[PDB]
Write a protein that binds this ligand. Structure first.
Ligand SMILES: *[C@@H]1O[C@H](CO)[C@@H](O)[C@H](O)[C@H]1NC(C)=O
Ligand SMILES: *[C@@H]1O[C@H](CO)[C@@H](O)[C@H](O)[C@H]1NC(C)=O
Ligand SMILES: *[C@@H]1O[C@H](CO)[C@@H](O)[C@H](O)[C@H]1NC(C)=O
Ligand SMILES: *[C@@H]1O[C@H](CO)[C@H](O)[C@H](O)[C@H]1NC(C)=O
Ligand SMILES: *[C@@H]1O[C@H](CO)[C@H](O)[C@H](O)[C@H]1NC(C)=O
Ligand SMILES: *[C@@H]1O[C@H](CO)[C@H](O)[C@H](O)[C@H]1NC(C)=O
Ligand SMILES: *[C@@H]1O[C@H](CO)[C@H](O)[C@H](O)[C@H]1NC(C)=O
Ligand SMILES: [Ca+2]
Ligand SMILES: [Ca+2]
Ligand SMILES: [Ca+2]
Ligand SMILES: [Ca+2]
Ligand SMILES: [Ca+2]
Ligand SMILES: [Ca+2]
Ligand SMILES: [Ca+2]
Lengths: 191, 83, 83
């Protein structure tokens, strides 16, 4: 059966107690518990030329990897060999990295596959702020989606159907309660 | 998120967000009140490296909300069955 | 206490009809900082992201390519704090 409101759900169809969700442990086989509990970090997945290290599964841009400062959780980025570029028949380009070098597909919305010897188009819709409400994949592309009350503008943004009355802002300035318009041009006192 | 799983910073810094108190959200933007700015401010929901001012006050503004239909969507009420 | 303040406490507004004003050339010592509302605040308090003098003038210009006052302490991304 599905999870209750006091539980958390996993990609494999597994249910977990809510307290375990961000306790610092991989109670979820997909590691969905600790997916982003660190502020502004990403775990077990990477933007187009970022690189992840065994210590805690955190991903960092390749340029900083061998820069001389430990960026990985365990400092594993700081070492910086090249040998595997000789071994690999990978399709594009190599970088000097610990564990004998690394190979990466062209930066423009592509990334490495099941091994560095192969490549696929990038996971657009994984970018924070790429769309206002929902995102879908397309052939070499991505598409926005807005819920039923909204209409889609500028290819990125969702705005509200004019059927509904114009949005208002209600705020207090200490002594008084004020009403205003979303454009910020007019203000009146409600109480 | 509702489960606390993915965490993102919209803005930070003493100069940008010195003393926020109240926050409200609509479409692309978040509206927040700041006692150090003595202002009501507008920012972008995903990232804003330079918030803007919607209203300037001589006193510290406390509370802010957005009034619109889509902020209060409809749903069924279980208590309708004779309370 | 209501005789002269921001509030209009009687229907005639006679509390705020007339009021005293500050004597010019008054002194804030060199150890301290001055606010646009003619009040004195310690220099160490100024850019602490918090409204120490209620016109907000202490937090008015932080990180205009500047640095913390020498006695203060600094937090890499956040703010200057008192000793
Ligand atoms: C890895 O290989 C499996 C089996 O061919 C395939 O289903 C899957 O899509 C591949 N994943 C990636 C990221 O290439
Ligand atoms: C706006 O709302 C009305 C009523 O639900 C609907 O008939 C109409 O198709 C909507 N328009 C858009 C552009 O979504
Ligand atoms: C909610 O239901 C009322 C009553 O039918 C309707 O007037 C209103 O437009 C609905 N709002 C939304 C957002 O569905
Ligand atoms: C799972 O969801 C269904 C609705 O699709 C029911 O609400 C069911 O009660 C849920 N399971 C649990 C354990 O609460
Ligand atoms: C009060 O302040 C005003 C300026 O706002 C004038 O300087 C006036 O002379 C002051 N009154 C006294 C008695 O000092
Ligand atoms: C008093 O304040 C004035 C400015 O209003 C001068 O700074 C002066 O030096 C201060 N100190 C004394 C002792 O007068
Ligand atoms: C900040 O430091 C610079 C030197 O790097 C200057 O001394 C400047 O005057 C300092 N700012 C303040 C407010 O003390
Ligand atoms: Ca656990
Ligand atoms: Ca966990
Ligand atoms: Ca490094
Ligand atoms: Ca008064
Ligand atoms: Ca203080
Ligand atoms: Ca201050
Ligand atoms: Ca603060």
């Amino acid at each position: 059966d599905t999870c209750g409101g006091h539980q958390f759900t996993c990609s494999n169809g597994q249910c977990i107690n809510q307290n375990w969700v961000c306790d610092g442990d991989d109670d979820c086989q997909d590691s969905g518990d600790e997916d982003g509990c660190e502020s502004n970090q990403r775990h077990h997945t990477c933007y187009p030329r970022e690189w992840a290290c065994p210590g805690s599964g955190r991903c960092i841009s390749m340029d900083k990897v061998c820069d001389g400062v430990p960026d990985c959780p365990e400092g594993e980025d700081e070492y910086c060999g090249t040998g595997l570029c000789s071994i690999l028949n990978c399709e594009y380009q190599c970088h000097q990295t610990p564990y004998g070098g690394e190979c990466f597909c062209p930066p423009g919305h592509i990334i490495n596959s099941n091994d560095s010897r192969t490549c696929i188009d990038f996971d657009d819709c994984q970018i924070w702020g790429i769309c206002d409400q929902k995102c879908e994949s397309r052939q070499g592309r991505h598409q926005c989606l807005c819920e039923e009350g909204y209409i889609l503008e500028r290819g990125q943004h969702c705005k509200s159907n004019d059927s509904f009355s114009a949005a208002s802002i209600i705020f207090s300035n200490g002594r008084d309660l004020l009403v205003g318009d979303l454009h910020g041009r007019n203000f009146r006192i409600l109480a | 998120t509702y489960d606390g799983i993915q965490r993102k910073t919209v803005a930070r810094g003493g100069s940008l967000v010195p003393h926020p108190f109240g926050i409200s959200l609509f479409e692309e933007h978040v509206f927040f009140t700041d006692w150090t700015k003595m202002a009501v401010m507008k920012a972008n929901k995903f990232t804003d490296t330079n918030p803007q001012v919607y209203h300037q006050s001589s006193l510290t503004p406390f509370g802010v909300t957005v009034y619109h239909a889509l902020r209060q969507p409809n749903a069924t009420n279980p208590c309708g069955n004779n309370n | 206490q209501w005789r002269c303040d921001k509030q209009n406490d009687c229907l005639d507004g006679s509390d705020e009809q007339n009021c005293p004003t500050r004597s010019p050339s008054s002194t804030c010592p060199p150890t301290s900082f001055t606010c646009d509302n003619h009040m004195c605040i310690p220099k160490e308090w100024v850019c602490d992201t918090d409204n120490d003098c209620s016109d907000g003038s202490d937090e008015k210009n932080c990180q205009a390519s500047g640095t913390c006052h020498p006695t203060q302490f600094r937090c890499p991304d956040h703010r200057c704090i008192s000793p």
